Amino acid sequence: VNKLELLPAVDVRDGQAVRLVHGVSGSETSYGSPLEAALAWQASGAEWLHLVDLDAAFGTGDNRALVAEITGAMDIKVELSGGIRDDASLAAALATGCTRVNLGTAALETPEWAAKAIAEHGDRIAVGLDVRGTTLKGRGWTSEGGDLYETLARLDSEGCARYVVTDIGKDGTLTGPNLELLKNVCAATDRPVVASGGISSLEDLRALAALVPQGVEGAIVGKALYAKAFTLEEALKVVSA
C-alpha cells in the first residue's frame, strides 16, 4: 500500500509567496520569496512542489519567468497550475519542464479544448475540480448547479488521468479537509485523486492517509505549512507510518 504523497504548495502573486482564503482574489496573506519557500520544502524532503501562478489564474498579468525559475530550481517533481486555458498558456507551462500541469476553469468553460489537451498530453495533465457541495466553480464562469458527478463522468470518458479536488469552502481556513467529499469522488472515479483545502493538523494528514486505499493519492498542503501548524518534516514522518 503506497504512502500518501505530499505536495507542499507555493502560490505566487506579484512575485510573492501568498495564501488565499476560499480562493478569493484579495484575500492574500504574504510570506516572502516563493523561490526560497520552494527550496525550503525541497530541503526538508518534499517529493513534489505544487506551484501556482495566481496572477495568471486571476487574469492580472502573470509570473511566467519566476515560475520557470522556480521549476528549474527544483530537482523534485513539480505540478504547475494557474490560468492554463489556451494553447499558449499550456505551452508556457509545459516549457518550464514541470512534471504535470493542472487545468481548472478550462475544463468547465472550454471542455473540447481541455479534452484535446488530455488526448494530446496524457498524464502530464490533471484536472482541478473546485467544489462547493456538488457545484463546480471557475474564474469568470458561473455554474448551472450540481455538476460535479456529470463532469467527473465526462472527464473520465475523455481519458483524464488524475483529479485535484479542492473544497473551496475549506481552502485557506485551517478548519480541516472535507473527507466526505473526497471519499465520494474516489468512489465515483477510478483515477487518482489529490486532496486539497483545509488541512490543519497532522491528524488531518492521518485521516487522508487512511484514504489511500480508496483512491486518494496525495494531498496539497498550503496554509498549514506557512502558518506553522506543523513542519513538513513532521508531515512526511506522519504519512510514513
Side-chain angles (χ1 to χ4, degrees):
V1 51
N2 285 79
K3 309 292 175 182
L4 183 74
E5 294 185 347
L6 302 181
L7 303 89
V10 172
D11 285 25
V12 184
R13 190 117 201 234
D14 192 28
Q16 309 297 307
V18 301
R19 292 309 302 172
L20 309 174
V21 180
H22 306 137
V24 176
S25 173
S27 67
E28 288 77 10
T29 295
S30 296
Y31 309 92
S33 170
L35 176 63
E36 293 186 44
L39 287 170
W41 302 147
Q42 175 169 254
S44 292
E47 93 183 74
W48 275 98
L49 176 69
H50 177 83
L51 179 58
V52 184
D53 187 341
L54 289 175
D55 283 307
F58 291 132
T60 57
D62 62 63
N63 298 269
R64 279 189 185 173
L66 178 60
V67 150
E69 180 178 8
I70 294 167
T71 302
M74 293 295 102
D75 298 317
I76 59 173
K77 298 171 278 191
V78 174
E79 174 172 69
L80 182 54
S81 195
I84 300 176
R85 54 186 45 140
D86 57 19
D87 289 359
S89 54
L90 176 63
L94 296 175
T96 67
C98 63
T99 311
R100 65 184 184 228
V101 302
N102 298 344
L103 309 186
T105 303
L108 311 174
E109 208 154 68
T110 56
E112 301 286 16
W113 179 84
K116 181 174 180 289
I118 289 165
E120 291 177 356
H121 296 283
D123 72 349
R124 261 191 107 189
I125 309 292
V127 173
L129 302 169
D130 292 341
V131 187
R132 282 218 185 243
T134 59
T135 298
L136 297 172
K137 301 283 173 180
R139 282 101 179 191
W141 189 82
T142 307
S143 186
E144 205 94 274
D147 53 349
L148 172 58
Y149 292 111
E150 283 172 25
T151 298
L152 200 57
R154 190 196 79 235
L155 288 169
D156 277 352
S157 75
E158 293 167 356
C160 188
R162 176 174 284 101
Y163 301 101
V164 177
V165 179
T166 303
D167 183 315
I168 295 154
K170 297 299 202 152
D171 200 15
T173 68
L174 296 166
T175 64
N178 190 340
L179 301 170
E180 198 50 41
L181 169 66
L182 289 166
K183 283 181 231 168
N184 285 288
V185 173
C186 286
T189 182
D190 55 26
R191 309 298 141 82
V193 166
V194 179
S196 174
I199 292 169
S200 81
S201 66
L202 295 175
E203 186 49 49
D204 289 344
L205 294 177
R206 294 186 187 97
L208 292 165
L211 300 178
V212 170
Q214 291 181 46
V216 173
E217 180 188 64
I220 297 160
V221 184
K223 192 167 285 180
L225 288 168
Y226 289 89
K228 304 187 173 175
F230 50 77
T231 65
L232 183 59
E233 291 84 351
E234 290 178 299
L236 287 166
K237 178 264 182 185
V238 165
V239 302
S240 286

